[PDB]
Enzyme design. Structure first.
Site, PDB file in Angstrom:
ATOM      1  N   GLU A  36       0.836  -1.202   0.073  1.00 57.46           N
ATOM      2  CA  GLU A  36      -0.102  -0.141  -0.052  1.00 57.46           C
ATOM      3  C   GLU A  36       0.983   1.385   0.183  1.00 57.46           C
ATOM      4  OE1 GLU A  36      -4.069  -1.538   2.500  1.00 57.46           O
ATOM      5  OE2 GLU A  36      -2.721   0.146   3.303  1.00 57.46           O
ATOM      6  N   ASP A  47      -7.001   9.316   9.206  1.00 62.18           N
ATOM      7  CA  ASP A  47      -5.783   8.384   9.771  1.00 62.18           C
ATOM      8  C   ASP A  47      -5.277   8.749  11.141  1.00 62.18           C
ATOM      9  OD1 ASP A  47      -5.162   8.653   6.653  1.00 62.18           O
ATOM     10  OD2 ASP A  47      -4.169   6.720   7.378  1.00 62.18           O
TER      11      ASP A  47
END
EC number: 4.2.1.20
Length: 244
Positions: A36, A47
């Site tokens: 990723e 996040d």
């Protein structure tokens, strides 16, 4: 998109600089089932604190959107490991979705994950990704109900990405619940990003059905500490998590 039992490294493109990201990927490729690569964004509100800070570092250091394609392209000269570009919608939307994916496919990207893809655009988006030959990866958190996990699964062509903002240092029960509910619903493989940091987390999550386990926070934290010299410690960290 990856073998069962896979460890999937997550790294922020351009943290601390594009050449280093490439160095980190190449040094970790031998342990990865897939990768990723995150595109830094000014407001990474989805996040954790560790990853948000890596987004800030990359942007301060001068990261530019297309430097992500350079990283993928260069990596591709040496490896064929599946690559998933992770990004917030804003960057994609502003640069033009169609051109972005074609360019993404061109540089070697295999799948894309749009962290905050507006439901209003979901359908058209997946259609555009498919035509471009780019697989889709959708995200689901612990507050995602079964009905939605199913809708997410039916749109997914790459793999469903389960996450837990809870952090730890143990995997929260709410995170195990998500994995347990997802394995009962998804036909697609599922990868989990629950903030692993200990070897038993990896062993435990794979044991509970996770087709793959992402490792981002643990790696990014090291990069924030060692900067360009993070490489060797990244490899050690990954070996610790693999019991090797």
């Amino acid at each position: 998109m990856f073998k069962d039992g896979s460890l999937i490294p997550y790294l922020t493109a351009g943290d601390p600089d594009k050449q280093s990201t490439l160095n980190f990927l190449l040094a970790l490729d031998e342990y990865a089932g897939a990768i990723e690569l995150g595109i830094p964004f000014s407001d990474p509100i989805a996040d954790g604190k560790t990853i948000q800070e890596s987004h800030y570092r990359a942007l301060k250091n001068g990261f530019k959107l297309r430097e992500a394609f350079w990283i993928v392209k260069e990596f591709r000269r040496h490896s064929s490991t599946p690559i998933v570009l992770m990004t917030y919608y804003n960057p994609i939307y502003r640069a033009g979705v169609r051109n972005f994916l074609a360019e993404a496919k061109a540089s070697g990207v295999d799948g894309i994950l749009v962290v905050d893809l507006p439901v209003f655009h979901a359908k058209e988006f997946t259609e555009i990704a498919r035509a471009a030959g780019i697989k889709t990866v959708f995200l689901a958190a612990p507050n995602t109900p079964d009905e939605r996990l199913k809708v997410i699964d039916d749109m997914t062509t790459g793999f469903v990405y389960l996450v837990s903002l809870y952090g730890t240092e143990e995997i929260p029960k709410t995170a195990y619940d998500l994995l347990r509910r997802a394995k009962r619903i998804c036909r697609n493989k599922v990868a989990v990003g629950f903030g692993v940091s200990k070897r038993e987390h990896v062993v435990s999550l794979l044991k509970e059905g996770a087709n793959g386990v992402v490792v981002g926070s643990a790696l990014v934290k090291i990069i924030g500490e060692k900067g360009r010299e993070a490489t060797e410690f990244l490899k050690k960290k990954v070996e610790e998590l693999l019991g090797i």
